[PDB]
Amino acid sequence: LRISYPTLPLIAMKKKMRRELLSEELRVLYVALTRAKEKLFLIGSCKDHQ
Amino acid sequence: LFEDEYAKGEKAFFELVDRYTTDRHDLDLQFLVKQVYEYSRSHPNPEAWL
Amino acid sequence: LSITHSADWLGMRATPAGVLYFHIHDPMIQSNLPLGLDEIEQEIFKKFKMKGLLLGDQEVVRLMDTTLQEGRSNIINAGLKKDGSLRSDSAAVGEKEFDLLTKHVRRTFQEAGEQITDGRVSIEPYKMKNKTPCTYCAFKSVCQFDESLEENEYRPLKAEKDKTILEWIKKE
Amino acid sequence: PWAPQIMEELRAQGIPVYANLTSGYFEAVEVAVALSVLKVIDNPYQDIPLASVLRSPIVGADENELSLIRLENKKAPYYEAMKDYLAAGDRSDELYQK
DNA sequence: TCTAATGCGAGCATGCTCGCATTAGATTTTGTTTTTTTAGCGGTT
Ligand code: SF4
């Protein structure tokens, strides 16, 4: 038929996976910041400040 | 393995290939098998989880 | 070539209608809405809408898509509004614009051939939209291109907007 | 991914940098060339690895000298052309000595 | 591959939102793991 679309468990697993992933990225950030002893620099870039 | 399955030519196998490969090659199915096997190896009983 | 020889080749002088690409493939339809068979067939059909460049005419577009009465086309990347005029999102340009590009190509050919005969074999990879020839090129080990090494740099090519490109063609 | 450019910039400023890398080995020109030598020793009938070794500082043939090699034999593999230039050339020339 | 910008017209409160369609852009990985024991030749063919 040449058709495809997400099944329910796929969407569920997608949402669930996004959650888990986000949570872990947070833990990554925590490890990164807790590494420091005396100084901490955060450099990030953006399109527009305002 | 893939050559043997194609050789056997079972309808089920083609039903799988058609769904998880592109219109000109079957590499994506290769990757799929690899990925699934690998993931299953993180359980104490990989087969049972499969 | 098709236009310049048109009068000689088959009979009479012609006018550039457009340049079209046809994507050869067996597409998969990704629909969130349930589709009847006719609707699926229509979506599959839509996947083969040709990209390229056209000449902005009611006549030209209508000739390329005789089904189009109003709205967007499923064959050519152009449309007709309720008013009837070609709608702005169409990939069409003026006859003059076509002439500008077509003259420009020959400009490039002339210069390139001249530099080729002059003995120019310099290592000058371009870089446009993070895309470089080098990845698709087999001679990376022959050139031994080394950015760190001085006097070995990419040619920055700008992702300029089509309108600008045309302006620059006008100037040149 | 961002690490290489950073290292370059810090060295431009003069700061000493150390990063444990897991990629980019075969993009090193030295590695590409040394490999090319190995391939050529394996089977000389690979035009690109050959040409690579020739233009490399290992041999040092320049673009004119390379095209000169081609001229001896156009249709043949580059290796054959190299063989032929060796056959017809005279000991007096620099390219022959290379 | 999903998010964002652009275009056009229908219904609403002549000018405005909203629906929808569509395309076009750009934007983009992380990782580690070993040692294998254990007693040189051979004069002379
Ligand atoms: S690889 Fe060497 S030759 Fe091929 S494009 Fe990049 S630079 Fe020019």
Side-chain angles (χ1 to χ4, degrees):
Chain A
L1 293 164
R2 310 265 76 222
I3 59 173
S4 93
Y5 50 85
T7 55
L8 282 192
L10 181 69
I11 300 171
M13 282 170 52
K14 233 100 116 146
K15 268 63 162 60
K16 157 174 186 188
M17 209 202 196
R18 195 176 206 281
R19 286 170 16 178
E20 292 193 356
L21 208 147
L22 253 37
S23 306
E24 195 185 41
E25 290 309 282
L26 221 37
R27 296 192 214 113
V28 169
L29 186 62
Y30 178 84
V31 171
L33 294 202
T34 54
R35 284 320 92 188
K37 276 184 176 181
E38 323 208 27
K39 269 298 285 201
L40 201 57
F41 288 99
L42 309 172
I43 321 95
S45 303
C46 171
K47 166 61 151 194
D48 176 26
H49 284 349
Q50 60 179 23
Chain B
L1 173 67
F2 270 47
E3 177 60 24
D4 284 358
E5 288 307 302
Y6 280 116
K8 279 198 284 163
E10 294 182 6
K11 191 157 106 185
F13 181 65
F14 292 118
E15 283 292 344
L16 174 64
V17 174
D18 285 344
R19 286 166 217 273
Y20 294 105
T21 74
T22 186
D23 63 353
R24 41 203 87 190
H25 62 87
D26 66 0
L27 297 177
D28 296 323
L29 183 61
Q30 237 209 343
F31 180 65
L32 171 58
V33 173
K34 287 302 201 78
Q35 194 176 171
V36 164
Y37 170 89
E38 192 215 340
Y39 202 107
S40 81
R41 276 231 131 185
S42 82
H43 289 260
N45 204 304
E47 286 200 10
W49 179 74
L50 286 176
Chain C
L1 280 152
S2 296
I3 292 303
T4 305
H5 299 355
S6 56
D8 170 33
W9 168 36
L10 42 89
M12 296 298 297
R13 174 84 181 191
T15 300
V19 279
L20 297 168
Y21 296 90
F22 186 94
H23 182 193
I24 291 189
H25 67 309
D26 190 17
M28 198 77 187
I29 303 298
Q30 318 235 102
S31 64
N32 225 359
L33 311 118
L35 304 174
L37 294 202
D38 297 329
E39 302 179 298
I40 300 172
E41 193 188 17
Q42 262 294 304
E43 289 294 316
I44 300 183
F45 178 79
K46 281 185 187 175
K47 283 305 195 66
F48 290 93
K49 168 140 73 181
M50 312 199 200
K51 293 188 183 64
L53 211 56
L54 272 78
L55 167 53
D57 244 279
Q58 160 171 357
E59 186 116 5
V60 167
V61 161
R62 281 178 99 210
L63 276 175
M64 294 206 187
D65 190 12
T66 59
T67 300
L68 180 58
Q69 234 59 244
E70 174 192 292
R72 255 148 162 167
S73 170
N74 298 335
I75 306 180
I76 249 55
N77 205 331
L80 298 180
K81 328 150 70 68
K82 171 183 182 163
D83 73 341
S85 73
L86 236 77
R87 47 184 288 164
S88 46
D89 38 30
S90 318
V93 296
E95 210 164 331
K96 159 182 154 286
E97 256 96 275
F98 251 157
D99 299 320
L100 252 60
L101 285 164
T102 304
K103 282 173 202 304
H104 177 16
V105 180
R106 301 207 265 191
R107 204 127 55 238
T108 301
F109 283 155
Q110 192 69 45
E111 178 64 12
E114 233 130 37
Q115 297 191 3
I116 282 178
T117 32
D118 287 341
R120 187 157 190 243
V121 298
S122 54
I123 306 181
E124 297 169 18
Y126 66 77
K127 185 190 296 296
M128 179 171 56
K129 300 200 274 192
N130 281 317
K131 300 306 173 185
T132 66
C134 304
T135 17
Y136 290 167
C137 184
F139 311 113
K140 185 120 78 279
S141 64
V142 187
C143 70
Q144 297 154 30
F145 184 87
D146 195 336
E147 200 178 357
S148 84
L149 188 148
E150 302 299 335
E151 206 173 341
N152 260 229
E153 58 189 359
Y154 291 88
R155 282 162 29 204
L157 295 195
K158 291 81 188 175
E160 290 308 276
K161 25 275 152 187
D162 314 273
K163 308 285 103 189
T164 50
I165 303 300
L166 276 168
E167 306 167 14
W168 308 9
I169 299 162
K170 179 198 208 77
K171 167 231 305 169
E172 300 174 347
Chain D
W2 271 18
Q5 274 133 309
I6 300 176
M7 296 205 280
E8 188 223 44
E9 191 74 15
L10 246 66
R11 292 161 199 271
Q13 312 275 274
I15 297 111
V17 187
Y18 171 82
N20 288 131
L21 303 196
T22 40
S23 59
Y25 185 71
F26 301 111
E27 303 177 7
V29 171
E30 327 87 69
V31 177
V33 161
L35 245 26
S36 273
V37 168
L38 289 190
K39 300 184 194 166
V40 156
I41 303 173
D42 182 55
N43 186 321
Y45 292 80
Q46 298 172 270
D47 288 341
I48 284 145
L50 179 58
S52 187
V53 170
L54 293 187
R55 194 185 172 279
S56 81
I58 293 178
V59 168
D62 57 44
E63 287 64 26
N64 275 293
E65 292 183 302
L66 288 175
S67 23
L68 240 46
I69 299 177
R70 171 49 60 192
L71 280 181
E72 292 296 331
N73 202 329
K74 307 191 80 65
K75 259 37 187 166
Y78 205 51
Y79 178 69
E80 227 96 76
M82 201 203 71
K83 294 273 301 305
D84 288 339
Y85 188 97
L86 271 183
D90 51 327
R91 292 236 156 205
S92 46
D93 290 341
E94 179 185 21
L95 181 51
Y96 173 93
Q97 276 297 321
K98 293 176 169 184

